[PDB]
From a paper:
The [name] receptor is an ATP-gated ion channel that activates inflammatory pathways involved in diseases such as cancer, atherosclerosis, and neurodegeneration. When present in high concentrations, such as in pathological inflammatory states, extracellular ATP acts as a danger signal to cells by binding to and activating the [name] receptor (P2X7R). This spatiotemporal signaling stimulates the innate immune system by triggering assembly of the NLRP3 inflammasome and subsequent cytokine release, as well as activation of various less understood signaling cascades, ultimately resulting in apoptosis. P2X7R antagonists bind to either classical or extended allosteric ligand-binding sites that exist within the extracellular domain at the interface of two protomers.
Author numbering:
A (entry chain C), B (entry chain A), C (entry chain B): 6 to 75, 83 to 435, 473 to 595
């Protein structure tokens, strides 16, 4: 109903005045809160992070004097050593080999072990070797004098097999400068900045400590940073990485979006010719001379500079913070988990029978028995088979959640439970019990005696006659609930019989949890039925409430 | 104060010995833990993942014999069929159309339906058609014999409208090989590796099962993988993707960082000429012949290979694991939520009056009544309007949280509550009540009788005279709290009057929660006031504690 | 054991029938659930998001009539104004400066302030100025007539220092069109789509409202969108961004994967010549004329269009949803936290002694005293030093968890605690106490009197003689636990002495929590020992249970 909707259940708690557990709780809480705040700040988990969208524009500056045997000196400019390719990459030629006046004809292949032939049997027509730039014609030919090489259809004259020039022809390229303009955007955050800000000094060169924001880089300085030697790499070439990292906080109070520049060689420093070490490409200049298409083939060596731009932009997001806080909230209940585990363990008797005698430092932790007693109440499943049995000659109570397979309940011994400390037949050991008058199937239930060993019956006790058999007590108990009650003698006697069973069960078992499922001894049962007999019929006996 | 800071509140709990609920709890816990661990391992939620920073370097190898009508055979090398463009992409020419000796002049446009004119009226001076590479001059001209085309300023001779050659001139390009060198970095994790490791066989070609780590790829094999036909795509061209995936675990014990190679065609397999199918571009060779700038225009068809490199690098992060664990901790309380929901539902009487008679399989779930009784205590808001009423002729108690609008409290019937089973006037049905002597506004409160229907007054009960009106009982109760108390007769009588109200309320209502807000019947009230009258003045009556 | 494994502990709770707290709980729950669902939907936190892998293919269409003084008109096509560079970028030449017939020789440098020399002293041999494309030879030379410039080895004739042409020679480039084909993939989700779908109109041009899905873009329209003027940027050049955003939901029921096109200028709108404003590059055409390698140097101005493709693809992931729900579950316990905080504060007496008299609106919140009483039970650490003391002349009880440094326990006054309202020597103020017969070290414990101020001893009370000293009461209490008990007179007397201590402690302190650690007054102690003396020996006294 409506009145049941507007309810609030609060947990019943026990507040413990303990230095140890209070200190533990607050230590746990402070550590957890400090780590939670530290993780939040360090990893900026309150921030939504957006990857950087980058655009790079490079401007390489520098001229080189190049000396080639012919000896002639020439000046190379950007139009000569730079091949406009990309923005996130630029290439600087550092060396070259020139093959001039090539033509599509038949020519003697350059002398090599795979090529040098003695007769036409050492060459197959149409053979396309992976190591040739030509297709075999089948016949050997004189490359020069004694040398006999396999003729091949290709661009001719064939390239000479020669290593790259040493020293590199554009070794002066380490003195070249590149200006890098990097525009970045965070479209989700709608933020864009660039690496060159107004007022930045433009006549500087980058230095990681002196000028770490000058976007002008000397290539030799890049190689020094990486520990690589420009002169060596210039010969055969390579690939260098210019990393631009953007750790950008777009919170206006803590705003910072500047690049960090780092350098990384990207080509393997290998000498395995099978792997094509360095960085080179064959680039052909075409020109029409003598009404024929010609080719100046240049094997271009150089260094490709890859501009690697990466990073994130963070701005405060409520949802991210909420998610993080919710992911951290359950950690504050671990103090309770730990302390409750301590209360549950140290309440165990084992911790005192064996441990404390050995480790006498832990004895003061016996207070957890009191804490557990005040904290936890143990209850059993109220099953129809549940029965509780008390013997006056025993200090404990037996729980029998076990079917009686025709066995006397006196002989069925179940697990012991402690009594709440509020403060003729063969199975009879008191000589005051009578056989059960129930159906034989259910007769074993009442085959129980007040005592496990021979002795005096509990019926002979004073308190049995004052508590259980006193008409005044039972009448008072009945009137307390029904003050004006008036019943026939038989109905009243039945009520007093029930109240007497109740009184015995409460007296010997205590809690109604046990007294509800208690079983009266035959002696007490039949004494009560003698004090309050029914006019007619037979007694139903124990009927479990569930 | 300080002593209040060092406190620990533990929750009071009820431990249930139940097979069903213990099994349910442990089943829930095991399932939740297993799923939590499985999710953690599978998605590596203990790891901080960094996107890969990639650098690609390609080396295409292969020569092609090209036959063009003129019939002449020529050998194409990389310098011829490759246009150095990028690292994450390479292009292989597969076909071409050559237009030689172009000049900037006035020329007859190539015959087309849009172009063919009969007179100068079919061409507008300065017209720039989207389908022309020229600007109209206004006059028709003879392309050849009868053909009359619109003269146009453009590069001349104009290109012939011809499809790409079939078969492709560089069909042998499927036999070409590309070596891909991929360098990757995880700057946050400070890890870099490359796809070619020392010892990798260099004379292999990639195969997805035999050699899935050879970075040398035959282009035809790529197309076979994709199910595309190289011969067909070579004619008009296309775009192929070489995907390099890096699933890299940088935990040293479980370290693995190798690439997975896959292939994906990236151009639409369309035949819509409006959409410019394939991949072609017009590239012009410039040469000075006859002291004039000329142009050999080549329509270059071929396949662009895009190298797509993606992936993540994971290394264990404490913060990520902490966040995940905290996000999973609350799921362990769902067993408690579920079982408490079961206890709350199955405690409902509805589950037994109607359900169990129908579904007799659920009857053993009646134990939840006991569990709920041992688990939950219901309390009401102690409002000034709160009043509890008990009639001896009823087995229940009425709660009246409702203002008395001049109505007798006997006539005001509130909702019924069950009594805690601890074990002359017109509105009078017992003939022992007197009218209220309070102000008329507050007189209706005491207009209550001990019984709802005619009968004997509860004052005639024995227990009323023994519990409520016995001087010994009240004196004992007062001395129990104040052993040495001694008061004037009037003060003592007032104390006994209060204690008698208390005794009636406790006897008929039980818990002080109800007895505090109980209302004594007029009969009992005035009998008590007769047994313990005050010397002078009038009786204040009921004063709610709140 | 096994029976202890199959247990379920449920929390004991108090259900409060309160409009205020029920409404607060449900308001909290509804707000939290609504925000949780809103965050989930808005941020799609049930989805695993994959970054887009993009491939771009551009096709620029348009021809321009170019007029250069010589005055001659020429038609430029793609082969002329487009430099095949990349897919994610395309370049359109908009202006150029041509330097024809350059040769590698010695030439007079172009007149500038840094260059103009009067004699050979104004030029250093081999000097490589950053602003020169040549290397100084050391001698001045006549550029023209009076002008004297420093001779320099370079490509000659040296380029004239001239601004870019105004108006731009390819100003008609704003009428050019580019078709952008964008293929995207989500490899984890195994989804690929493209921006051109079947049925898309191909004769349109993009408009942000009319045709926001036409992938054909007029460049001038892009600049209008950005608010930039194409004519101005065409002169010196620039960089424009075409952003393609993919917000793609790959859930089939809510599936949508289409691009959003936006435009952003990427070059800084700077006029600082040091920063190389615009976008230009020097591109050289090489031709062999007169058996010499020549160079037509073109300074190419134009606009680079960067195609920026970004976005995510989301598909439902169970793990992500589970993580989010778990991160949100603990927020539902904040209603309980808040209401329990309210119960804990408003139970404070301070809220009534001072606050309510001032703020009389809060008085009805005094019910939290009742709620806290029904919710929280406070217990103390049962330390060996813990002792409770009650004086009959005081209404409260004193807790002494403090060692007695030879001080009489009567003089040691500890903190006050309220009694559970169940309902000759110098330190003696009643004249019935005797000195302690314990060892002097432990004698101060029993140096306690029944009353703090002079008066009658509690032993003179009737209830002391009826409850504590009545043999019947104690015998009944002993038989209630041991009905058939029979002991020697000395053992029985010891049992009655213990039970009398128990009865006094229970009567004056109540709960066994206090009565366990209570200290009997010397008067009561010795009266009890007189009523039940031991045959021989001395009395041990108080022994703390812990
Ligand atoms: C870790 C747990 C235990 C405690 C939770 C701490 C939070 C209260 C902190 C974490 C991140 C903090 C935020 C970090 C960044 C910002 C941005 C800041 O705004 C700006 O800096 C920009 C101002 C502008 O928008 O113009 C305002 C404070 C705020 C929201 C902070 C408010 C306090 C927050 C939410
Ligand atoms: C899912 C819930 C219920 C249980 C939590 C399980 C954790 C205890 C697991 C999850 C991930 C595990 C980690 C996975 C990876 C590593 C890296 C491993 O280190 C290495 O492999 C590299 C060693 C090196 O650093 O040189 C050390 C163990 C550790 C921290 C593991 C420790 C155990 C962890 C934290
Ligand atoms: C926010 C808290 C308090 C409540 C949790 C809500 C969930 C039950 C919602 C959140 C996201 C929802 C999902 C969003 C998307 C989908 C995909 C949908 O499948 C499709 O659309 C594609 C069908 C196909 O696979 O072919 C099926 C429903 C499902 C799983 C939804 C089921 C209901 C979900 C898990
Ligand atoms: C950097 O590289 C250059 C070129 O490889 C090294 O100089 C060469 O060193 C070898 C061995 O001594 C000589 O035979 C060559 O004649 C040198 N060439 C030049 C250009 O002088 C140079 O030594 C390397 N750097 C360092 C520091 O060792
Ligand atoms: C790719 O290379 C293979 C191997 O050279 C070619 O197949 C050969 O083709 C010739 C001419 O038809 C035959 O004489 C050979 O017997 C073939 N060899 C094998 C092993 O089959 C193939 O034609 C080439 N493909 C293209 C498109 O050029
Ligand atoms: C792969 O593509 C080639 C070229 O389109 C196909 O070969 C052509 O097929 C048509 C139809 O039979 C013939 O008219 C042409 O003469 C063929 N050209 C060549 C080069 O032979 C080839 O059939 C396609 N692959 C497959 C398996 O069908
Ligand atoms: C867009 O740019 C063009 C070129 O800069 C501007 O046209 C020039 O404007 C100046 C100043 O009035 C004149 O001296 C030039 O002769 C103009 N050039 C041309 C090509 O006409 C134009 O004004 C700019 N757009 C707007 C709207 O101001
Ligand atoms: N706990 C308990 N209850 C009993 C016992 N014997 C009888 N009762 C209760 O007494 C009632 C039956 O009374 P009884 O004299 O046995 O049968 P009756 O004469 O037919 O009413 C039922 O409510 C039983 O639960 C017993 O040994 N233990
Ligand atoms: N629960 C309850 N308390 C009552 C009732 N009548 C009086 N009291 C209490 O008795 C005290 C007043 O005593 P009373 O004889 O009514 O008035 P007095 O003579 O002025 O003291 C107050 O503490 C009341 O709360 C009643 O019907 N029910
Ligand atoms: N709470 C409490 N227990 C007491 C006090 N005096 C004695 N006892 C208990 O009584 C028992 C000792 O009885 P006592 O006559 O003092 O000594 P005994 O004659 O050697 O047995 C122990 O269990 C004590 O805890 C007292 O003042 N307070
Ligand atoms: C007598 O019964 C003493 C036995 C104590 C058993 C508890 C042992 C404590 C060690 C931890 C056991 C639980 C695992 C917790 C892992 C963090
Ligand atoms: C007896 O009850 C002693 C129990 C004490 C439990 C503490 C066990 C060590 C764990 C300490 C962890 C927190 C650091 C110390 C807090 C002061
Ligand atoms: C008599 O009162 C029996 C009525 C039982 C009502 C409970 C019905 C159980 C079905 C679930 C209802 C709550 C929704 C839970 C969704 C997971
Ligand atoms: C009466 O109290 C029976 C209640 C039993 C509750 C179980 C209802 C079915 C839900 C089971 C979910 C867990 C799987 C089975 C555990 C053994
Ligand atoms: C008398 O004792 C009244 C004092 C009340 C103290 C409580 C003050 C309430 C304000 C909040 C204090 C706790 C911080 C909560 C932050 C959200
Ligand atoms: C006395 O016990 C009054 C306590 C009332 C607590 C409410 C204090 C204000 C916080 C309200 C937050 C939720 C919105 C209002 C719910 C109806
Ligand atoms: Na949580
Ligand atoms: Zn017997
Ligand atoms: Zn017996
Ligand atoms: Zn009446
Ligand atoms: Zn009456
Ligand atoms: Zn004294
Ligand atoms: Zn005294």
């Amino acid at each position: 109903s409506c009145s049941d909707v507007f309810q609030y259940e609060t947990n019943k708690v026990t507040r413990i005045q303990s230095m140890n557990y209070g200190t533990i709780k607050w230590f746990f809480h402070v550590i957890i809160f400090s780590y939670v705040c530290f993780a939040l700040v360090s990893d900026k988990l309150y921030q939504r992070k957006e990857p950087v969208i980058s655009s790079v524009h490079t401007k390489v500056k520098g001229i080189a004097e190049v000396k080639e045997e012919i000896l002639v000196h020439s000046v190379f400019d950007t139009a000569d050593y730079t091949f406009p390719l990309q923005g996130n990459s630029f290439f600087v030629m550092t060396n070259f080999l020139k093959t001039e006046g090539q033509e599509q004809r038949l020519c003697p292949e350059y002398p090599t072990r795979r090529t040098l032939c003695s007769s036409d049997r050492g060459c197959k027509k149409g053979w396309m070797d992976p190591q040739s730039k030509g297709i075999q014609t089948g016949r050997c030919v004189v490359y020069e004098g004694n040398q006999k090489t396999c003729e091949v259809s290709a661009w001719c004259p064939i390239e000479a097999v020669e290593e790259a020039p040493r020293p590199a022809l554009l070794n002066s390229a380490e003195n070249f400068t590149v200006l890098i303009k990097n525009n970045i955007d965070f479209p989700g955050h709608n933020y864009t900045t660039r690496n060159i800000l107004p007022g930045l000094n433009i006549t500087c060169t980058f230095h990681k400590t002196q000028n770490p924001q000058c976007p002008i880089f000397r290539l030799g300085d890049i190689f020094r940073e990486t520990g690589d030697n420009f002169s060596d790499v210039a010969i055969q070439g390579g690939i260098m990485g210019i990393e631009i990292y953007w750790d950008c906080n777009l919170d206006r109070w803590f705003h910072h979006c500047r690049p960090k520049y780092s350098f990384r060689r990207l080509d393997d420093k290998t000498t395995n010719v099978s792997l094509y070490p360095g960085y080179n490409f064959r680039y052909a200049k075409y020109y029409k001379e003598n009404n024929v298409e010609k080719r100046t083939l240049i094997k271009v060596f150089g260094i490709r500079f890859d501009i690697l731009v990466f990073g994130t932009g963070g701005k405060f997001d409520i949802i991210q913070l909420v998610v993080y806080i919710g992911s951290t909230l359950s950690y504050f209940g671990l103090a309770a988990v730990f302390i409750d585990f301590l209360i549950d363990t140290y309440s165990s008797n084992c911790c005192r029978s064996h441990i404390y005698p050995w480790c006498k430092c832990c004895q003061p932790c016996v207070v957890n028995e009191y804490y557990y007693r005040k904290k936890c109440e143990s209850i059993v499943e109220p099953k129809p088979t549940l029965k509780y049995v008390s013997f006056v000659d025993e200090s404990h109570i037996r729980m029998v959640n076990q079917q009686l397979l025709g066995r006397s309940l006196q002989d069925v011994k179940g697990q012991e439970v402690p009594r709440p400390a509020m403060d003729s037949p063969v199975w009879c050991q008191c000589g005051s019990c009578l056989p059960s008058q129930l159906p034989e199937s259910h007769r074993c239930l009442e085959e129980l005696c007040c005592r496990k060993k021979p002795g005096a019956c509990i019926t002979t006790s004073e308190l049995f006659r004052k508590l259980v058999l006193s008409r005044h007590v039972l009448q008072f108990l009945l009137l307390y609930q029904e003050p004006l009650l008036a019943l026939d003698v038989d109905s009243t006697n039945s009520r007093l019989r029930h109240c007497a069973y109740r009184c015995y069960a409460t007296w010997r078992f205590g809690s109604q949890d046990m007294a509800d499922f208690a079983i009266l001894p035959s002696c007490c049962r039949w004494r009560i039925r003698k004090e309050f007999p029914k006019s007619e019929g037979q007694y139903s006996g124990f009927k479990s409430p569930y």
